[PDB]
Amino acid sequence: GAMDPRTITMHKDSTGHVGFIFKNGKITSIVKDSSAARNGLLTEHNICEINGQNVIGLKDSQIADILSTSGTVVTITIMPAF
Ligand SMILES: [O]
């Protein structure tokens, strides 16, 4: 629910992308018509886990690298914040 973590499974498109951008670990925009959009990834939520790995505290370059090098399945657990 509103306060709670949610886990979203996405699949990469033909160029290896799932459909979002982020900054300082927070998702900031979803790409229209993407896997992220279809599967309900949310903006203003922090990236907690990717493919079951906790990434809290990692810098953006590392989160980016994990996303870019992932296989086609990308599962992300996200968390709201105030
Ligand atoms: O997390």
PDB file of N, CA and C in Angstrom, residues 1-6 42 45 79-82:
ATOM      1  N   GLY A   1       0.849  -1.224   0.000  1.00  0.00           N
ATOM      2  CA  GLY A   1       0.000   0.000   0.000  1.00  0.00           C
ATOM      3  C   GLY A   1       0.865   1.246   0.000  1.00  0.00           C
ATOM      4  N   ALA A   2       0.293   2.367   0.428  1.00  0.00           N
ATOM      5  CA  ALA A   2       0.892   3.675   0.189  1.00  0.00           C
ATOM      6  C   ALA A   2       2.220   3.841   0.897  1.00  0.00           C
ATOM      7  N   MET A   3       2.316   3.251   2.094  1.00  0.00           N
ATOM      8  CA  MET A   3       3.503   3.393   2.937  1.00  0.00           C
ATOM      9  C   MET A   3       4.497   2.301   2.675  1.00  0.00           C
ATOM     10  N   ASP A   4       4.118   1.263   1.900  1.00  0.00           N
ATOM     11  CA  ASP A   4       4.772  -0.038   1.987  1.00  0.00           C
ATOM     12  C   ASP A   4       5.682  -0.296   0.806  1.00  0.00           C
ATOM     13  N   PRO A   5       6.693  -1.160   0.936  1.00  0.00           N
ATOM     14  CA  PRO A   5       7.530  -1.495  -0.236  1.00  0.00           C
ATOM     15  C   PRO A   5       6.614  -2.137  -1.306  1.00  0.00           C
ATOM     16  N   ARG A   6       6.947  -2.005  -2.586  1.00  0.00           N
ATOM     17  CA  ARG A   6       6.335  -2.877  -3.595  1.00  0.00           C
ATOM     18  C   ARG A   6       7.406  -3.355  -4.526  1.00  0.00           C
ATOM     19  N   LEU A  42       6.866   3.258  -9.833  1.00  0.00           N
ATOM     20  CA  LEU A  42       6.415   4.582  -9.387  1.00  0.00           C
ATOM     21  C   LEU A  42       7.551   5.562  -9.169  1.00  0.00           C
ATOM     22  N   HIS A  45       9.873   7.187  -5.465  1.00  0.00           N
ATOM     23  CA  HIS A  45      10.162   6.027  -4.651  1.00  0.00           C
ATOM     24  C   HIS A  45      11.654   5.713  -4.788  1.00  0.00           C
ATOM     25  N   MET A  79      10.471   1.837  -2.424  1.00  0.00           N
ATOM     26  CA  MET A  79       9.963   2.288  -1.132  1.00  0.00           C
ATOM     27  C   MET A  79       9.618   3.758  -1.192  1.00  0.00           C
ATOM     28  N   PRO A  80       8.470   4.158  -0.665  1.00  0.00           N
ATOM     29  CA  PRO A  80       8.145   5.589  -0.604  1.00  0.00           C
ATOM     30  C   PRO A  80       9.035   6.298   0.419  1.00  0.00           C
ATOM     31  N   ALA A  81       9.024   7.620   0.367  1.00  0.00           N
ATOM     32  CA  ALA A  81       9.731   8.436   1.346  1.00  0.00           C
ATOM     33  C   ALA A  81       9.072   9.793   1.444  1.00  0.00           C
ATOM     34  N   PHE A  82       9.119  10.328   2.649  1.00  0.00           N
ATOM     35  CA  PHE A  82       8.697  11.686   2.977  1.00  0.00           C
ATOM     36  C   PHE A  82       9.869  12.612   3.202  1.00  0.00           C
TER      37      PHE A  82
END
